[PDB]
Design a binder for this molecule. Structure first.
Ligand code: HEC
Ligand code: HEC
Ligand code: HEC
Ligand code: HEC
Ligand code: HEC
Ligand code: HEC
Ligand code: HEC
Ligand code: HEC
Ligand code: HEC
Ligand code: HEC
Ligand code: HEC
Ligand code: HEC
Ligand code: HEC
Ligand code: HEC
Lengths: 292, 292
């Protein structure tokens, strides 16, 4: 028993290596990337969405580490991670691994609520989602991979081993977070906001529970907490918004909204991002009843 | 157990809690911080340097989480982490935990070379260097520290268990990195640069091998490699500078220096930061001899 074959004829899973002309005898590089061609080709209908030149060929044939004429000196690095890709007035607009994943988060309603307010860390755990080779790869295979003298038979074995060894990280249950939270730090013109904490988290999670792209990148058990509880270590008891966001203006931290704007911008930000019908940003009592 | 008594009378080590107005029954907060008064007072001479209002009292007496008139509304968060602190005309210019530590890396020659070119990540591992309590602390104890009803002997106990469980990360030996590196990616007007890789690393580590501040914050075995090999997952075989820095200016990545500038800015940046006498920025042939 092996990986399921593709309709396209491309290998089901593929190790991608840092291909360039320059010798790399010490194997100075990121871990290589195992790309699952099978699941991507099933999800994305047009081959040439990715194979933007119409050549059903490895990107690295034109995009090398240093760059070359066949790819107009757009490097491997650029081709795989580019985020600011200009629309092409004629013919195909290329995509990168990173730009397409990001477009997914902006374009799909079930993703665009959280992703309207998340700021991604882009840390080691992020890189490792792709830079993910199996440990059984040898330095020798690495050189061969780098030199392009690896046999596809060996490439595919390494790739199937990695894929078969992958395990999806389970998000913690919303049962381990508060049922409700009475937000009353600022209560004055209005009553406290009775935020449906667990209802909200449960709902957001259910809409993405089987998404393979979300599952790969949502890769620490408490990472979804950080959607709102941002910029602090993942934890089942994060610090309060009011620890960092002051009630009055904080000249020392102009990037920081004051605490009322913090709640408004975050709550309303998601609501707008995934087109919540109620409450509207102009509805001033649904989130907090007027005080008597 | 107990730790070495101080000359000053302050407890040797102290648990600091998120002290403020409003009730926090769930302990929604960062881990408390255990401050080692002993080592600090043996290094910083004047008490007023820290206890900027003279009388040595807990900072959160004036700097609460929410902030109050007694601290000019400067919150606990600002008090502990402030980096943008104005020279005080009259009297004492206050310091923060973060600001003093930053000053050290800038004012000590043995630190200012590396720290002239590193950009700190300020990630979880950074936070945890101070937010560091022993797991033996109980919710209940958390509540008492927050409400200010925890017994001093109980505070002292907590801190001592924490301090006595602490461990230092030992950096990887320079024997696990290249002895020398022939930097030839751009070789043209000049011969390659025969970089004394292990000697540079070994020399830099030597000057800081006892330093307790560096030891706490250099808290991954391969983190010192990141001084130069930045912005990639820690590894004994980091990618080449060239993978990310293009020979010519990346118009897609305007902020990125091109490869020659990367080298020049990095090598000369440190040299200047720790006043290296030679090579000067103008001693071109000292880093790369003129080509035949
Ligand atoms: C983006 C989501 C892709 C879609 C849609 C399709 N392909 Fe692809 N393919 C993609 C990548 C990132 C790569 C490069 C992997 C590498 O080895 O460097 C590939 C590779 C191929 C290849 C080359 C096989 C190899 O050299 O090992 C073939 C033959 C190929 N893909 C063809 C192909 C076809 C026919 C597709 C539509 C049915 C198709 N791909 C979709 C990314 C993507
Ligand atoms: C040679 C036959 C190529 C192959 C195979 C792949 N790409 Fe390519 N890429 C190529 C050129 C000549 C160009 C410039 C086209 C233009 O409109 O100017 C590009 C550019 C890209 C880009 C855009 C970069 C930017 O605009 O900043 C990306 C992101 C890109 N290429 C990615 C990419 C991927 C993922 C490929 C494999 C699936 C791939 N290219 C193959 C030439 C060639
Ligand atoms: C859109 C045109 C994409 C491009 C280009 C790339 N990826 Fe992607 N990826 C995309 C989708 C829509 C999905 C989910 C598929 C599904 O069945 O829902 C994914 C998923 C991934 C994953 C997670 C699945 C896994 O194999 O673990 C990874 C790690 C991944 N994608 C990597 C990846 C790389 C390395 C790419 C460039 C070579 C890349 N993707 C391009 C959409 C698109
Ligand atoms: C809130 C409950 C979320 C929902 C629903 C979705 N995403 Fe998410 N995502 C969330 C967080 C808090 C994070 C971590 C931020 C960080 O520091 O990295 C992420 C991260 C991702 C990523 C990686 C970061 C990026 O590239 O932007 C990807 C690719 C991603 N998320 C995809 C994704 C998709 C496709 C979703 C809808 C199916 C989706 N997520 C929903 C939080 C939440
Ligand atoms: C936004 C959609 C959130 C997500 C996802 C999670 N939390 Fe949350 N939580 C959120 C808010 C706006 C608040 C109020 C904070 C304030 O200072 O006003 C909270 C509160 C908590 C608390 C504190 C409860 C209390 O009684 O004070 C805890 C312990 C908490 N949140 C935990 C938590 C965890 C573990 C999460 C991921 C599973 C999580 N939160 C998700 C908003 C959001
Ligand atoms: C300190 C550890 C923080 C806690 C706790 C929370 N936030 Fe925050 N937030 C913080 C910073 C440093 C910044 C400024 C970012 C910058 O670089 O400018 C912010 C910013 C916001 C924003 C603006 C949009 C954004 O960049 O995310 C909002 C809407 C916001 N903060 C809201 C918010 C809420 C509601 C929180 C409790 C759940 C919260 N933040 C916690 C630092 C910290
Ligand atoms: C949910 C999506 C909200 C909407 C829509 C509005 N507000 Fe809001 N508001 C929200 C929270 C979570 C909080 C914090 C509650 C607390 O007491 O700490 C607030 C706060 C305010 C406040 C300050 C608190 C008070 O005076 O009671 C004011 C003055 C306020 N909100 C004004 C306001 C108006 C005018 C709105 C309609 C445009 C409105 N809020 C919407 C959440 C949400
Ligand atoms: C030592 C140099 C610290 C580093 C590094 C960081 N913090 Fe800190 N923080 C420090 C102290 C002495 C205190 C007071 C004691 C306490 O635990 O309250 C704090 C306090 C906070 C707070 C406010 C209290 C709370 O809500 O728990 C926050 C929100 C906080 N610290 C956050 C924080 C984060 C996210 C850090 C890494 C980015 C971080 N601190 C670094 C000292 C030190
Ligand atoms: C900064 C490097 C300091 C120097 C120099 C000195 N002290 Fe200190 N002290 C400092 C901190 C961060 C704290 C706060 C602890 C807390 O719980 O908030 C303390 C604590 C004390 C105390 C205890 C006060 C109390 O907790 O009620 C005393 C009595 C004290 N410090 C005295 C003191 C003297 C006399 C010093 C000079 C010889 C001195 N401190 C140096 C920070 C720093
Ligand atoms: C200068 C005026 C400082 C202020 C204010 C604070 N710290 Fe500090 N820190 C300072 C020095 C010079 C040293 C090393 C002293 C030596 O013996 O060489 C340190 C050390 C630390 C450490 C690491 C050692 C340890 O105790 O684990 C930590 C974790 C630390 N400092 C924490 C800390 C906190 C929490 C502070 C604010 C409450 C704080 N420091 C103030 C110099 C100065
Ligand atoms: C190069 C060999 C270094 C020397 C010599 C010193 N430091 Fe360092 N330090 C270095 C790196 C690569 C990092 C990691 C940055 C990150 O991403 O966290 C650090 C980090 C620190 C920190 C933490 C960040 C900060 O608050 O600035 C501190 C406090 C620190 N280093 C202290 C320090 C001191 C006091 C030094 C001289 C005795 C010193 N550094 C030397 C690299 C190197
Ligand atoms: C060490 C501190 C240096 C000093 C002083 C100067 N240069 Fe440099 N330069 C350095 C390195 C590590 C490299 C990369 C070497 C390689 O082959 O990759 C360079 C590169 C150059 C180059 C390009 C390579 C070549 O043409 O051979 C040029 C044009 C260059 N450096 C010029 C230059 C001049 C004029 C300097 C004095 C004013 C100078 N460099 C200083 C390291 C160092
Ligand atoms: C700056 C003072 C550095 C520190 C600290 C470390 N390295 Fe380094 N390294 C540095 C340069 C300028 C280069 C040249 C890379 C290039 O692309 O031009 C290197 C090179 C390496 C290499 C590759 C050498 C080869 O023959 O290919 C490796 C494997 C390497 N470095 C590893 C390494 C490790 C593990 C380090 C910490 C223990 C480390 N280096 C630190 C500059 C600096
Ligand atoms: C991609 C994974 C990189 C590798 C490998 C190296 N560098 Fe880098 N460098 C990178 C980025 C994305 C940036 C821009 C950050 C910004 O704020 O714009 C930089 C920046 C530099 C600089 C300028 C100062 C700085 O911000 O650090 C220098 C001097 C530099 N890079 C040099 C450098 C060298 C010599 C490298 C090999 C040892 C190297 N970088 C690797 C990303 C990446």
């Amino acid at each position: 028993a092996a990986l399921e074959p593709t309709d396209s004829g491309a290998p089901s899973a593929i190790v991608m290596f840092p291909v360039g002309e320059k010798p790399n005898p010490k194997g100075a590089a990121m871990k290589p990337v195992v790309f699952n061609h099978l699941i991507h080709e099933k999800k994305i209908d047009n081959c040439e969405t990715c194979h933007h030149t119409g050549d059903p060929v490895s990107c690295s044939t034109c995009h090398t580490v240093e760059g070359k004429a066949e790819g107009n000196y757009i490097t491997l690095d650029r081709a795989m991670h580019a985020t600011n890709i200009a629309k092409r007035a004629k013919g195909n607009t290329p995509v990168s691994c990173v730009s397409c994943h990001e477009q997914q988060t902006k374009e799909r309603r079930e993703c665009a609520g959280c992703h309207a307010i998340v700021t991604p860390k882009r840390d080691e755990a992020w890189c490792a989602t792709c830079h993910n080779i199996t440990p059984s790869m040898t330095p020798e295979q690495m050189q061969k991979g780098i030199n392009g003298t690896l046999l596809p038979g060996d490439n595919e074995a390494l790739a199937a081993e990695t894929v078969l060894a992958q395990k999806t990280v389970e998000p913690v249950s919303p049962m381990l977070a508060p049922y409700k939270v009475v937000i009353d730090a600022l209560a004055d013109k209005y009553e406290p906001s009775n935020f449906t904490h667990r209802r909200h988290l449960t709902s957001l999670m259910e809409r993405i529970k089987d998404d393979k792209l979300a599952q790969a990148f949502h890769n620490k058990p408490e990472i979804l907490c950080a959607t709102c509880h941002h910029r602090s270590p993942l934890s089942l008891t994060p610090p309060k918004c009011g620890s960092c966001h002051t009630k009055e203006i904080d000249k020392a931290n102009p990037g920081r909204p004051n605490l009322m704007a913090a709640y408004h911008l975050q709550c309303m930000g998601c609501h707008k991002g995934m087109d919540v019908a109620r409450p509207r940003d102009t509805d001033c009592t649904t989130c907090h009843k007027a005080a008597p």
